[PDB]
PDB file of C-alpha atoms in Angstrom:
ATOM      1  CA  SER A 242      21.454 -31.917  -8.947  1.00  0.00           C
ATOM      2  CA  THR A 243      20.942 -28.635  -7.155  1.00  0.00           C
ATOM      3  CA  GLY A 244      20.063 -25.043  -7.969  1.00  0.00           C
ATOM      4  CA  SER A 245      20.649 -21.747  -6.174  1.00  0.00           C
ATOM      5  CA  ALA A 246      19.216 -18.361  -7.196  1.00  0.00           C
ATOM      6  CA  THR A 247      19.151 -14.961  -5.574  1.00  0.00           C
ATOM      7  CA  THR A 248      15.766 -13.429  -4.869  1.00  0.00           C
ATOM      8  CA  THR A 249      15.456  -9.638  -4.703  1.00  0.00           C
ATOM      9  CA  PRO A 250      12.755  -7.373  -3.219  1.00  0.00           C
ATOM     10  CA  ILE A 251      10.811  -5.499  -5.904  1.00  0.00           C
ATOM     11  CA  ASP A 252      10.711  -2.277  -3.902  1.00  0.00           C
ATOM     12  CA  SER A 253      11.802  -0.610  -0.668  1.00  0.00           C
ATOM     13  CA  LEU A 254       8.952  -2.237   1.293  1.00  0.00           C
ATOM     14  CA  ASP A 255       9.635  -5.859   0.306  1.00  0.00           C
ATOM     15  CA  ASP A 256       6.170  -6.021  -1.285  1.00  0.00           C
ATOM     16  CA  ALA A 257       7.301  -9.107  -3.202  1.00  0.00           C
ATOM     17  CA  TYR A 258      10.493 -10.819  -4.326  1.00  0.00           C
ATOM     18  CA  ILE A 259      11.668 -11.650  -7.841  1.00  0.00           C
ATOM     19  CA  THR A 260      14.011 -14.405  -8.928  1.00  0.00           C
ATOM     20  CA  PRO A 261      15.544 -14.722 -12.403  1.00  0.00           C
ATOM     21  CA  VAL A 262      14.401 -17.766 -14.375  1.00  0.00           C
ATOM     22  CA  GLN A 263      15.754 -18.980 -17.718  1.00  0.00           C
ATOM     23  CA  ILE A 264      13.053 -20.170 -20.151  1.00  0.00           C
ATOM     24  CA  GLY A 265      13.589 -21.636 -23.601  1.00  0.00           C
ATOM     25  CA  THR A 266      16.467 -21.985 -26.035  1.00  0.00           C
ATOM     26  CA  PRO A 267      18.274 -19.681 -26.322  1.00  0.00           C
ATOM     27  CA  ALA A 268      17.432 -18.665 -22.768  1.00  0.00           C
ATOM     28  CA  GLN A 269      14.916 -15.907 -22.174  1.00  0.00           C
ATOM     29  CA  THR A 270      15.391 -14.620 -18.630  1.00  0.00           C
ATOM     30  CA  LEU A 271      12.256 -13.474 -16.830  1.00  0.00           C
ATOM     31  CA  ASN A 272      11.980 -12.289 -13.235  1.00  0.00           C
ATOM     32  CA  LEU A 273       9.350 -14.400 -11.536  1.00  0.00           C
ATOM     33  CA  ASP A 274       7.600 -14.235  -8.184  1.00  0.00           C
ATOM     34  CA  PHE A 275       8.225 -17.587  -6.493  1.00  0.00           C
ATOM     35  CA  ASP A 276       4.953 -18.429  -4.788  1.00  0.00           C
ATOM     36  CA  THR A 277       4.650 -21.301  -2.316  1.00  0.00           C
ATOM     37  CA  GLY A 278       0.920 -20.570  -2.156  1.00  0.00           C
ATOM     38  CA  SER A 279       0.123 -21.470  -5.781  1.00  0.00           C
ATOM     39  CA  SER A 280       1.087 -24.060  -8.373  1.00  0.00           C
ATOM     40  CA  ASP A 281       1.181 -22.438 -11.813  1.00  0.00           C
ATOM     41  CA  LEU A 282       4.275 -21.161 -13.601  1.00  0.00           C
ATOM     42  CA  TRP A 283       2.866 -18.405 -15.797  1.00  0.00           C
ATOM     43  CA  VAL A 284       4.533 -15.593 -17.683  1.00  0.00           C
ATOM     44  CA  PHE A 285       3.881 -12.403 -19.542  1.00  0.00           C
ATOM     45  CA  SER A 286       4.338 -13.302 -23.172  1.00  0.00           C
ATOM     46  CA  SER A 287       4.135 -12.307 -26.808  1.00  0.00           C
ATOM     47  CA  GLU A 288       0.515 -13.533 -26.546  1.00  0.00           C
ATOM     48  CA  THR A 289      -0.445 -11.149 -23.725  1.00  0.00           C
ATOM     49  CA  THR A 290      -3.005  -8.521 -24.724  1.00  0.00           C
ATOM     50  CA  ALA A 291      -0.785  -5.568 -25.648  1.00  0.00           C
ATOM     51  CA  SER A 292      -2.629  -2.986 -23.534  1.00  0.00           C
ATOM     52  CA  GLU A 293      -2.039  -5.213 -20.489  1.00  0.00           C
ATOM     53  CA  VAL A 294       1.754  -5.196 -20.858  1.00  0.00           C
ATOM     54  CA  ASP A 295       3.519  -2.211 -19.270  1.00  0.00           C
ATOM     55  CA  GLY A 296       7.257  -2.731 -18.893  1.00  0.00           C
ATOM     56  CA  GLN A 297       7.390  -6.467 -18.167  1.00  0.00           C
ATOM     57  CA  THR A 298       9.810  -8.744 -19.937  1.00  0.00           C
ATOM     58  CA  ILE A 299       7.906 -11.205 -22.115  1.00  0.00           C
ATOM     59  CA  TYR A 300       8.430 -14.821 -23.093  1.00  0.00           C
ATOM     60  CA  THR A 301       8.193 -15.332 -26.862  1.00  0.00           C
ATOM     61  CA  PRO A 302       7.730 -19.047 -27.478  1.00  0.00           C
ATOM     62  CA  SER A 303       8.201 -18.704 -31.246  1.00  0.00           C
ATOM     63  CA  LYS A 304      11.834 -17.693 -30.554  1.00  0.00           C
ATOM     64  CA  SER A 305      12.501 -20.803 -28.457  1.00  0.00           C
ATOM     65  CA  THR A 306      13.594 -23.872 -30.392  1.00  0.00           C
ATOM     66  CA  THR A 307      12.548 -26.097 -27.485  1.00  0.00           C
ATOM     67  CA  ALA A 308       9.053 -24.625 -27.012  1.00  0.00           C
ATOM     68  CA  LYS A 309       6.092 -26.828 -27.900  1.00  0.00           C
ATOM     69  CA  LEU A 310       2.447 -25.823 -27.691  1.00  0.00           C
ATOM     70  CA  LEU A 311       0.593 -28.100 -25.291  1.00  0.00           C
ATOM     71  CA  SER A 312      -2.331 -28.768 -27.572  1.00  0.00           C
ATOM     72  CA  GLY A 313      -5.733 -27.844 -26.205  1.00  0.00           C
ATOM     73  CA  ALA A 314      -4.438 -26.749 -22.797  1.00  0.00           C
ATOM     74  CA  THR A 315      -5.631 -23.589 -21.111  1.00  0.00           C
ATOM     75  CA  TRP A 316      -5.246 -22.107 -17.648  1.00  0.00           C
ATOM     76  CA  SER A 317      -6.967 -19.516 -15.509  1.00  0.00           C
ATOM     77  CA  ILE A 318      -6.147 -18.484 -11.970  1.00  0.00           C
ATOM     78  CA  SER A 319      -7.477 -16.098  -9.363  1.00  0.00           C
ATOM     79  CA  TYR A 320      -5.389 -15.164  -6.345  1.00  0.00           C
ATOM     80  CA  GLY A 321      -6.323 -14.297  -2.773  1.00  0.00           C
ATOM     81  CA  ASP A 322      -5.698 -10.618  -3.437  1.00  0.00           C
ATOM     82  CA  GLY A 323      -8.307 -10.545  -6.208  1.00  0.00           C
ATOM     83  CA  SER A 324      -5.815 -10.546  -9.081  1.00  0.00           C
ATOM     84  CA  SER A 325      -6.029 -13.020 -11.969  1.00  0.00           C
ATOM     85  CA  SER A 326      -4.554 -14.189 -15.255  1.00  0.00           C
ATOM     86  CA  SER A 327      -5.252 -16.757 -17.962  1.00  0.00           C
ATOM     87  CA  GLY A 328      -4.011 -18.152 -21.252  1.00  0.00           C
ATOM     88  CA  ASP A 329      -2.587 -21.163 -23.052  1.00  0.00           C
ATOM     89  CA  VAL A 330       0.335 -23.492 -22.367  1.00  0.00           C
ATOM     90  CA  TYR A 331       3.704 -24.437 -23.802  1.00  0.00           C
ATOM     91  CA  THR A 332       6.249 -26.931 -22.581  1.00  0.00           C
ATOM     92  CA  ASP A 333       9.839 -25.715 -22.602  1.00  0.00           C
ATOM     93  CA  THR A 334      13.157 -25.916 -20.791  1.00  0.00           C
ATOM     94  CA  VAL A 335      13.216 -23.961 -17.528  1.00  0.00           C
ATOM     95  CA  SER A 336      16.267 -23.364 -15.379  1.00  0.00           C
ATOM     96  CA  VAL A 337      16.550 -21.807 -11.935  1.00  0.00           C
ATOM     97  CA  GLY A 338      19.951 -21.078 -10.505  1.00  0.00           C
ATOM     98  CA  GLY A 339      21.606 -23.800 -12.580  1.00  0.00           C
ATOM     99  CA  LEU A 340      18.884 -26.448 -12.062  1.00  0.00           C
ATOM    100  CA  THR A 341      17.225 -27.425 -15.342  1.00  0.00           C
ATOM    101  CA  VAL A 342      13.847 -29.036 -16.020  1.00  0.00           C
ATOM    102  CA  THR A 343      12.955 -30.067 -19.552  1.00  0.00           C
ATOM    103  CA  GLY A 344       9.305 -30.247 -20.561  1.00  0.00           C
ATOM    104  CA  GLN A 345       8.122 -27.815 -17.892  1.00  0.00           C
ATOM    105  CA  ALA A 346       4.650 -26.400 -18.427  1.00  0.00           C
ATOM    106  CA  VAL A 347       5.057 -22.678 -19.072  1.00  0.00           C
ATOM    107  CA  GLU A 348       1.659 -21.014 -18.936  1.00  0.00           C
ATOM    108  CA  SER A 349       1.562 -18.120 -21.370  1.00  0.00           C
ATOM    109  CA  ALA A 350      -0.736 -15.267 -20.383  1.00  0.00           C
ATOM    110  CA  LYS A 351      -3.255 -13.980 -22.879  1.00  0.00           C
ATOM    111  CA  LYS A 352      -4.917 -11.843 -20.199  1.00  0.00           C
ATOM    112  CA  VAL A 353      -3.729 -10.428 -16.881  1.00  0.00           C
ATOM    113  CA  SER A 354      -5.577  -8.250 -14.368  1.00  0.00           C
ATOM    114  CA  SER A 355      -4.677  -4.638 -13.712  1.00  0.00           C
ATOM    115  CA  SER A 356      -2.562  -5.385 -10.623  1.00  0.00           C
ATOM    116  CA  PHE A 357      -0.168  -7.428 -12.742  1.00  0.00           C
ATOM    117  CA  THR A 358      -0.029  -4.884 -15.565  1.00  0.00           C
ATOM    118  CA  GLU A 359       0.697  -2.122 -13.073  1.00  0.00           C
ATOM    119  CA  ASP A 360       3.661  -3.961 -11.576  1.00  0.00           C
ATOM    120  CA  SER A 361       6.438  -3.650 -14.140  1.00  0.00           C
ATOM    121  CA  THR A 362       8.881  -5.621 -11.996  1.00  0.00           C
ATOM    122  CA  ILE A 363       7.086  -8.996 -12.001  1.00  0.00           C
ATOM    123  CA  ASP A 364       7.214 -10.956 -15.262  1.00  0.00           C
ATOM    124  CA  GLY A 365       5.107 -13.844 -13.947  1.00  0.00           C
ATOM    125  CA  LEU A 366       4.804 -16.357 -11.118  1.00  0.00           C
ATOM    126  CA  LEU A 367       6.522 -19.643 -10.369  1.00  0.00           C
ATOM    127  CA  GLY A 368       4.260 -21.757  -8.168  1.00  0.00           C
ATOM    128  CA  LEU A 369       5.778 -23.950  -5.462  1.00  0.00           C
ATOM    129  CA  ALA A 370       2.676 -25.275  -3.687  1.00  0.00           C
ATOM    130  CA  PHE A 371       1.444 -28.798  -4.448  1.00  0.00           C
ATOM    131  CA  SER A 372       0.656 -29.722  -8.041  1.00  0.00           C
ATOM    132  CA  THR A 373      -2.934 -30.599  -7.107  1.00  0.00           C
ATOM    133  CA  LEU A 374      -3.635 -26.828  -7.239  1.00  0.00           C
ATOM    134  CA  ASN A 375      -2.336 -26.397 -10.788  1.00  0.00           C
ATOM    135  CA  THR A 376      -5.053 -24.872 -12.968  1.00  0.00           C
ATOM    136  CA  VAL A 377      -4.152 -26.262 -16.411  1.00  0.00           C
ATOM    137  CA  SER A 378      -7.090 -27.934 -18.114  1.00  0.00           C
ATOM    138  CA  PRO A 379      -7.873 -30.549 -19.300  1.00  0.00           C
ATOM    139  CA  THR A 380      -4.582 -32.097 -18.150  1.00  0.00           C
ATOM    140  CA  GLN A 381      -3.205 -30.744 -14.884  1.00  0.00           C
ATOM    141  CA  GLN A 382       0.516 -29.940 -14.970  1.00  0.00           C
ATOM    142  CA  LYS A 383       3.331 -30.313 -12.437  1.00  0.00           C
ATOM    143  CA  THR A 384       5.226 -27.526 -10.703  1.00  0.00           C
ATOM    144  CA  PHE A 385       8.884 -26.875 -11.382  1.00  0.00           C
ATOM    145  CA  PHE A 386       9.756 -28.431  -8.014  1.00  0.00           C
ATOM    146  CA  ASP A 387       7.624 -31.528  -8.631  1.00  0.00           C
ATOM    147  CA  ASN A 388       9.340 -32.007 -12.015  1.00  0.00           C
ATOM    148  CA  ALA A 389      12.832 -31.468 -10.572  1.00  0.00           C
ATOM    149  CA  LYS A 390      12.355 -33.472  -7.389  1.00  0.00           C
ATOM    150  CA  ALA A 391      13.578 -36.898  -8.451  1.00  0.00           C
ATOM    151  CA  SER A 392      16.803 -35.414  -9.865  1.00  0.00           C
ATOM    152  CA  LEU A 393      17.593 -33.329  -6.783  1.00  0.00           C
ATOM    153  CA  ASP A 394      20.251 -34.430  -4.300  1.00  0.00           C
ATOM    154  CA  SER A 395      17.527 -34.143  -1.618  1.00  0.00           C
ATOM    155  CA  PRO A 396      13.821 -33.512  -2.361  1.00  0.00           C
ATOM    156  CA  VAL A 397      13.725 -30.058  -0.791  1.00  0.00           C
ATOM    157  CA  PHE A 398      13.850 -26.385  -1.507  1.00  0.00           C
ATOM    158  CA  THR A 399      14.606 -23.562   0.893  1.00  0.00           C
ATOM    159  CA  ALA A 400      13.469 -19.953   1.145  1.00  0.00           C
ATOM    160  CA  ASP A 401      15.812 -17.426   2.726  1.00  0.00           C
ATOM    161  CA  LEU A 402      14.122 -14.081   2.130  1.00  0.00           C
ATOM    162  CA  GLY A 403      15.905 -10.867   3.093  1.00  0.00           C
ATOM    163  CA  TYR A 404      14.631  -7.864   4.989  1.00  0.00           C
ATOM    164  CA  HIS A 405      15.162  -4.915   2.671  1.00  0.00           C
ATOM    165  CA  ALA A 406      17.920  -7.016   1.054  1.00  0.00           C
ATOM    166  CA  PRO A 407      18.403  -9.910  -1.360  1.00  0.00           C
ATOM    167  CA  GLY A 408      18.029 -13.519  -0.277  1.00  0.00           C
ATOM    168  CA  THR A 409      18.180 -16.989  -1.750  1.00  0.00           C
ATOM    169  CA  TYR A 410      16.075 -19.870  -3.050  1.00  0.00           C
ATOM    170  CA  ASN A 411      17.983 -23.172  -3.038  1.00  0.00           C
ATOM    171  CA  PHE A 412      16.821 -26.432  -4.598  1.00  0.00           C
ATOM    172  CA  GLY A 413      18.070 -29.863  -3.580  1.00  0.00           C
ATOM    173  CA  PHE A 414      20.239 -29.000  -0.576  1.00  0.00           C
ATOM    174  CA  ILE A 415      20.233 -27.274   2.788  1.00  0.00           C
ATOM    175  CA  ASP A 416      22.931 -24.609   3.182  1.00  0.00           C
ATOM    176  CA  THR A 417      24.016 -25.169   6.772  1.00  0.00           C
ATOM    177  CA  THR A 418      25.847 -21.814   6.774  1.00  0.00           C
ATOM    178  CA  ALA A 419      22.622 -19.882   6.118  1.00  0.00           C
ATOM    179  CA  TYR A 420      21.012 -20.184   9.551  1.00  0.00           C
ATOM    180  CA  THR A 421      21.835 -20.207  13.248  1.00  0.00           C
ATOM    181  CA  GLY A 422      21.036 -22.955  15.732  1.00  0.00           C
ATOM    182  CA  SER A 423      18.962 -25.881  14.508  1.00  0.00           C
ATOM    183  CA  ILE A 424      16.126 -26.325  12.054  1.00  0.00           C
ATOM    184  CA  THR A 425      12.868 -27.322  13.741  1.00  0.00           C
ATOM    185  CA  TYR A 426      10.655 -29.464  11.563  1.00  0.00           C
ATOM    186  CA  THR A 427       6.880 -29.496  11.831  1.00  0.00           C
ATOM    187  CA  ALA A 428       4.078 -31.502  10.204  1.00  0.00           C
ATOM    188  CA  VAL A 429       2.391 -30.419   6.968  1.00  0.00           C
ATOM    189  CA  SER A 430      -1.103 -31.124   5.695  1.00  0.00           C
ATOM    190  CA  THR A 431      -1.360 -31.170   1.917  1.00  0.00           C
ATOM    191  CA  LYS A 432      -5.157 -31.545   1.989  1.00  0.00           C
ATOM    192  CA  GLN A 433      -5.760 -28.033   0.649  1.00  0.00           C
ATOM    193  CA  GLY A 434      -2.737 -28.131  -1.673  1.00  0.00           C
ATOM    194  CA  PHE A 435      -0.713 -25.747   0.490  1.00  0.00           C
ATOM    195  CA  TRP A 436       2.302 -25.977   2.758  1.00  0.00           C
ATOM    196  CA  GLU A 437      -0.118 -25.956   5.687  1.00  0.00           C
ATOM    197  CA  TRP A 438       1.159 -26.331   9.246  1.00  0.00           C
ATOM    198  CA  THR A 439       0.244 -25.476  12.841  1.00  0.00           C
ATOM    199  CA  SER A 440       2.178 -22.880  14.797  1.00  0.00           C
ATOM    200  CA  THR A 441       2.329 -23.526  18.534  1.00  0.00           C
ATOM    201  CA  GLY A 442       1.625 -19.937  19.606  1.00  0.00           C
ATOM    202  CA  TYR A 443       2.890 -16.398  19.780  1.00  0.00           C
ATOM    203  CA  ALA A 444       4.287 -13.562  21.853  1.00  0.00           C
ATOM    204  CA  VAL A 445       4.141  -9.797  21.424  1.00  0.00           C
ATOM    205  CA  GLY A 446       7.362  -7.936  22.140  1.00  0.00           C
ATOM    206  CA  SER A 447       8.907  -9.044  25.418  1.00  0.00           C
ATOM    207  CA  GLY A 448       5.561 -10.446  26.583  1.00  0.00           C
ATOM    208  CA  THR A 449       4.851 -13.975  27.694  1.00  0.00           C
ATOM    209  CA  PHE A 450       4.362 -16.666  25.104  1.00  0.00           C
ATOM    210  CA  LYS A 451       0.770 -17.770  24.526  1.00  0.00           C
ATOM    211  CA  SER A 452       0.513 -21.464  23.713  1.00  0.00           C
ATOM    212  CA  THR A 453      -2.221 -21.843  21.129  1.00  0.00           C
ATOM    213  CA  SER A 454      -2.534 -23.757  17.865  1.00  0.00           C
ATOM    214  CA  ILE A 455      -2.588 -21.563  14.768  1.00  0.00           C
ATOM    215  CA  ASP A 456      -3.136 -23.441  11.505  1.00  0.00           C
ATOM    216  CA  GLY A 457      -1.838 -21.569   8.494  1.00  0.00           C
ATOM    217  CA  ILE A 458       0.137 -21.702   5.279  1.00  0.00           C
ATOM    218  CA  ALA A 459       3.740 -20.860   4.496  1.00  0.00           C
ATOM    219  CA  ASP A 460       3.221 -18.534   1.541  1.00  0.00           C
ATOM    220  CA  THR A 461       6.132 -16.708  -0.063  1.00  0.00           C
ATOM    221  CA  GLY A 462       3.725 -15.064  -2.511  1.00  0.00           C
ATOM    222  CA  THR A 463       1.825 -13.156   0.194  1.00  0.00           C
ATOM    223  CA  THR A 464       3.481 -10.009   1.523  1.00  0.00           C
ATOM    224  CA  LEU A 465       2.036  -9.811   5.030  1.00  0.00           C
ATOM    225  CA  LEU A 466       1.335 -11.989   8.056  1.00  0.00           C
ATOM    226  CA  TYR A 467      -2.398 -12.757   8.383  1.00  0.00           C
ATOM    227  CA  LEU A 468      -3.474 -14.210  11.739  1.00  0.00           C
ATOM    228  CA  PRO A 469      -6.664 -14.576  13.794  1.00  0.00           C
ATOM    229  CA  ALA A 470      -8.302 -11.331  14.908  1.00  0.00           C
ATOM    230  CA  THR A 471      -7.598 -12.081  18.581  1.00  0.00           C
ATOM    231  CA  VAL A 472      -3.854 -12.410  17.945  1.00  0.00           C
ATOM    232  CA  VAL A 473      -3.711  -9.333  15.727  1.00  0.00           C
ATOM    233  CA  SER A 474      -5.648  -7.223  18.252  1.00  0.00           C
ATOM    234  CA  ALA A 475      -3.223  -8.273  20.995  1.00  0.00           C
ATOM    235  CA  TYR A 476      -0.297  -7.175  18.841  1.00  0.00           C
ATOM    236  CA  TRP A 477      -1.619  -3.753  17.826  1.00  0.00           C
ATOM    237  CA  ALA A 478      -2.844  -2.999  21.362  1.00  0.00           C
ATOM    238  CA  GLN A 479       0.865  -2.625  22.197  1.00  0.00           C
ATOM    239  CA  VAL A 480       1.296   0.218  19.690  1.00  0.00           C
ATOM    240  CA  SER A 481      -0.010   3.582  20.882  1.00  0.00           C
ATOM    241  CA  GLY A 482      -2.454   5.055  18.406  1.00  0.00           C
ATOM    242  CA  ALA A 483      -2.786   1.915  16.264  1.00  0.00           C
ATOM    243  CA  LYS A 484      -6.271   1.137  15.014  1.00  0.00           C
ATOM    244  CA  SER A 485      -8.121  -0.912  12.464  1.00  0.00           C
ATOM    245  CA  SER A 486      -9.247   1.289   9.617  1.00  0.00           C
ATOM    246  CA  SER A 487     -12.098   0.022   7.457  1.00  0.00           C
ATOM    247  CA  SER A 488     -11.394   2.758   4.899  1.00  0.00           C
ATOM    248  CA  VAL A 489      -7.720   1.835   4.545  1.00  0.00           C
ATOM    249  CA  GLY A 490      -8.355  -1.908   4.803  1.00  0.00           C
ATOM    250  CA  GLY A 491      -6.549  -2.970   7.943  1.00  0.00           C
ATOM    251  CA  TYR A 492      -4.511  -1.901  10.924  1.00  0.00           C
ATOM    252  CA  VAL A 493      -2.639   1.352  10.636  1.00  0.00           C
ATOM    253  CA  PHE A 494      -0.335   2.988  13.142  1.00  0.00           C
ATOM    254  CA  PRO A 495       1.418   6.335  13.659  1.00  0.00           C
ATOM    255  CA  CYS A 496       4.578   6.366  11.567  1.00  0.00           C
ATOM    256  CA  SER A 497       6.359   7.830  14.636  1.00  0.00           C
ATOM    257  CA  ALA A 498       5.854   4.560  16.549  1.00  0.00           C
ATOM    258  CA  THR A 499       8.494   2.034  17.458  1.00  0.00           C
ATOM    259  CA  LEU A 500       6.920  -1.366  16.722  1.00  0.00           C
ATOM    260  CA  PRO A 501       7.323  -4.347  19.037  1.00  0.00           C
ATOM    261  CA  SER A 502       8.586  -7.672  17.740  1.00  0.00           C
ATOM    262  CA  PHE A 503       6.267 -10.610  17.139  1.00  0.00           C
ATOM    263  CA  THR A 504       7.280 -14.171  17.973  1.00  0.00           C
ATOM    264  CA  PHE A 505       5.674 -17.300  16.520  1.00  0.00           C
ATOM    265  CA  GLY A 506       6.134 -20.882  17.691  1.00  0.00           C
ATOM    266  CA  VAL A 507       7.413 -23.774  15.615  1.00  0.00           C
ATOM    267  CA  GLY A 508       7.103 -26.757  17.915  1.00  0.00           C
ATOM    268  CA  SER A 509       9.152 -25.806  20.975  1.00  0.00           C
ATOM    269  CA  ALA A 510      11.213 -23.337  18.912  1.00  0.00           C
ATOM    270  CA  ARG A 511      10.543 -19.634  18.452  1.00  0.00           C
ATOM    271  CA  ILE A 512      10.981 -17.326  15.464  1.00  0.00           C
ATOM    272  CA  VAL A 513      11.226 -13.632  16.261  1.00  0.00           C
ATOM    273  CA  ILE A 514      10.008 -11.086  13.727  1.00  0.00           C
ATOM    274  CA  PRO A 515      11.667  -7.733  14.527  1.00  0.00           C
ATOM    275  CA  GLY A 516       9.326  -4.792  14.854  1.00  0.00           C
ATOM    276  CA  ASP A 517      10.780  -3.029  11.814  1.00  0.00           C
ATOM    277  CA  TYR A 518       9.689  -5.966   9.607  1.00  0.00           C
ATOM    278  CA  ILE A 519       6.077  -5.063  10.486  1.00  0.00           C
ATOM    279  CA  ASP A 520       6.306  -1.501   9.083  1.00  0.00           C
ATOM    280  CA  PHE A 521       4.871  -1.124   5.563  1.00  0.00           C
ATOM    281  CA  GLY A 522       5.216   2.629   5.491  1.00  0.00           C
ATOM    282  CA  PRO A 523       2.838   5.493   4.777  1.00  0.00           C
ATOM    283  CA  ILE A 524      -0.627   4.512   3.606  1.00  0.00           C
ATOM    284  CA  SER A 525      -0.245   7.119   0.859  1.00  0.00           C
ATOM    285  CA  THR A 526       2.704   9.301  -0.090  1.00  0.00           C
ATOM    286  CA  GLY A 527       3.400  11.883   2.605  1.00  0.00           C
ATOM    287  CA  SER A 528       0.987  10.417   5.157  1.00  0.00           C
ATOM    288  CA  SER A 529       2.004   9.999   8.797  1.00  0.00           C
ATOM    289  CA  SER A 530      -0.291   6.954   9.080  1.00  0.00           C
ATOM    290  CA  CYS A 531       1.611   3.748   8.336  1.00  0.00           C
ATOM    291  CA  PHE A 532       0.300   0.367   7.219  1.00  0.00           C
ATOM    292  CA  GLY A 533       0.807  -2.628   9.471  1.00  0.00           C
ATOM    293  CA  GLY A 534       2.496  -5.852   8.441  1.00  0.00           C
ATOM    294  CA  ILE A 535       0.370  -8.052  10.707  1.00  0.00           C
ATOM    295  CA  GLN A 536      -3.288  -8.107   9.664  1.00  0.00           C
ATOM    296  CA  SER A 537      -6.409 -10.099  10.477  1.00  0.00           C
ATOM    297  CA  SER A 538      -7.159 -13.237   8.488  1.00  0.00           C
ATOM    298  CA  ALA A 539     -10.835 -13.003   9.400  1.00  0.00           C
ATOM    299  CA  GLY A 540     -12.791 -13.481   6.207  1.00  0.00           C
ATOM    300  CA  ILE A 541      -9.757 -14.771   4.271  1.00  0.00           C
ATOM    301  CA  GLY A 542     -10.678 -18.170   5.623  1.00  0.00           C
ATOM    302  CA  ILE A 543      -7.077 -19.164   6.305  1.00  0.00           C
ATOM    303  CA  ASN A 544      -4.097 -17.858   8.255  1.00  0.00           C
ATOM    304  CA  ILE A 545      -1.126 -16.925   6.100  1.00  0.00           C
ATOM    305  CA  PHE A 546       2.497 -16.885   7.146  1.00  0.00           C
ATOM    306  CA  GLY A 547       3.570 -14.559   4.360  1.00  0.00           C
ATOM    307  CA  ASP A 548       6.844 -12.786   3.738  1.00  0.00           C
ATOM    308  CA  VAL A 549       6.731 -10.765   6.977  1.00  0.00           C
ATOM    309  CA  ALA A 550       7.009 -14.050   8.903  1.00  0.00           C
ATOM    310  CA  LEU A 551       9.079 -16.100   6.485  1.00  0.00           C
ATOM    311  CA  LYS A 552      11.810 -13.504   6.023  1.00  0.00           C
ATOM    312  CA  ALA A 553      12.599 -13.786   9.757  1.00  0.00           C
ATOM    313  CA  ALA A 554      13.550 -17.439   9.178  1.00  0.00           C
ATOM    314  CA  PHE A 555      15.433 -19.898   7.046  1.00  0.00           C
ATOM    315  CA  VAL A 556      12.580 -22.095   5.775  1.00  0.00           C
ATOM    316  CA  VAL A 557      12.839 -25.662   4.484  1.00  0.00           C
ATOM    317  CA  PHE A 558      10.105 -26.941   2.211  1.00  0.00           C
ATOM    318  CA  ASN A 559      10.674 -30.679   2.513  1.00  0.00           C
ATOM    319  CA  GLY A 560       9.022 -32.521  -0.365  1.00  0.00           C
ATOM    320  CA  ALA A 561       9.777 -36.024   0.893  1.00  0.00           C
ATOM    321  CA  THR A 562       7.052 -38.664   0.584  1.00  0.00           C
ATOM    322  CA  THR A 563       5.550 -37.176   3.736  1.00  0.00           C
ATOM    323  CA  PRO A 564       6.205 -33.446   3.355  1.00  0.00           C
ATOM    324  CA  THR A 565       7.278 -31.312   6.308  1.00  0.00           C
ATOM    325  CA  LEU A 566       8.352 -27.716   6.935  1.00  0.00           C
ATOM    326  CA  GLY A 567      11.475 -26.624   8.760  1.00  0.00           C
ATOM    327  CA  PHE A 568      12.215 -23.253  10.369  1.00  0.00           C
ATOM    328  CA  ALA A 569      15.486 -21.903  11.736  1.00  0.00           C
ATOM    329  CA  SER A 570      16.492 -18.498  13.039  1.00  0.00           C
ATOM    330  CA  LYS A 571      19.177 -16.712  11.015  1.00  0.00           C
TER     331      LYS A 571
END
């Protein structure tokens, strides 16, 4: 089997992407944030504290003839950005782009943090990291991909995120029309539960490539590109007037600037992030100070190839017995 679904930016900045997901019988369609940096599929629901729902579409398990409470199971997750959610668990039928999994754990939120409430466009998350990170207790549950894998034509999914435009998540096949040149595959460590890999270096604008190993994660659920302070300083030094602002929480730059591109290495291959992808607009409405899309990972504890990086590529998440990651230009 295969599946193919369009993923759409939630706003004009590409702060996140949502993908429609069918849950239950009859189908209830929720728009979920596909997150290769976590491993829980959780949704706003009829069980979510009412004051914490503000415009989201909810899953109502009592209206699904295929929903079954997973007795005794609870979940609770905290994300890198400080947000969190928790609740109980159902199993139900979940379909993405025509690919159907029966008995998928659907984690129903009883509580969500303010960041989730305040974002009316995201109805929940669909985790695509390794199932070892799944938070369901006392019996850990499998991700949608892990459940689907054996049925797929090939044990892969691909992320093709758009810049200020829709893109595609495919399951079970590689669309050879969706990228240019070849896909370069690179080794993955699953030791931390992430799609963790080592970039071979970087360049800033038309500058020379610096060969240096940068370990990080391919994370569709993180907006920005978080890299070591040395790398980030080298980038922003090429933008007149850019500075790190403690009060704002990262590098800012004059909105009048033209940003240079940023290149990252995948083996001997190179992915070029155009300068415009690095612009996250005014820090506050009407400001002429703009927020940068490349930020320091210092004190995150890990480098994160988030959407800023991934949207410059066609990305293969290869879930073969030994997982790997592939990147192509597009």
